[PDB]
């Protein structure tokens, strides 16, 4: 019975079997968040460039860090951007899968700085909904904000 929750604390102390981070395609460390997912597996950012829309394991130890790389909307066109934000999750799911891990920490991707300024709390959950739904991996989306918590946990609760 593999289900979907929501958890408001850093992604960096999840206790899944393995995490997402939110990347930029440079596989550089970056700061606010992804600071925290560099400090507590920094090794993971050996060789972890991979392109927008695009998702690569690098592992820390046998811990699996996946890189994912949402579009930045500053950047690209709303449905540009849209196709890349659901590439991405698509690859996230691709990787857990071939992990074979029970559970994965995801955060939701493009809903930071690279969200051109616009709420995309639906659109990013709904593109992780359509990918991670063919999977049978417990998923622990992480968030900051206390209402995009209760969102979540809104939208979570009202497809069982
Ligand atoms: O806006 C976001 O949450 C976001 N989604 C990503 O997919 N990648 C990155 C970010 C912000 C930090 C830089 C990399």
Request: proline fraction near 4%; aromatic fraction near 12%; avoid cysteine.
């Given at each position: 019975a593999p289900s979907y929750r929501v958890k408001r604390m850093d992604?960096?102390?999840?206790?899944?079997?393995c995490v997402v981070n939110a990347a930029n395609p440079r596989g550089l460390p970056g700061d606010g968040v992804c600071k925290a997912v560099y400090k507590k597996?920094?090794?993971?950012?050996?060789?972890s460039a991979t392109p927008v829309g695009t998702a690569k394991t690098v592992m820390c130890g046998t811990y699996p860090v996946i890189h994912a790389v949402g579009p930045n909307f500053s950047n690209y066109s709303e449905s540009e951007g849209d196709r890349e934000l659901a590439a991405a999750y698509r690859e996230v799911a691709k990787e857990v899968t071939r992990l074979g891990v029970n559970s994965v920490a995801i955060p939701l991707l493009?809903?930071?700085?690279?969200?051109?300024?616009?709420?995309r709390l639906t659109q990013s959950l709904n593109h992780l909904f359509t990918a991670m739904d063919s999977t049978d991996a417990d998923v622990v989306i992480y968030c900051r904000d206390k209402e995009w918590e209760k969102k979540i946990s809104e939208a979570i609760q009202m497809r069982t």
């Open positions: 992604i960096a102390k999840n206790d899944e079997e597996w920094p090794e993971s950012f050996k060789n493009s809903t930071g700085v690279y969200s051109g300024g616009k709420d």
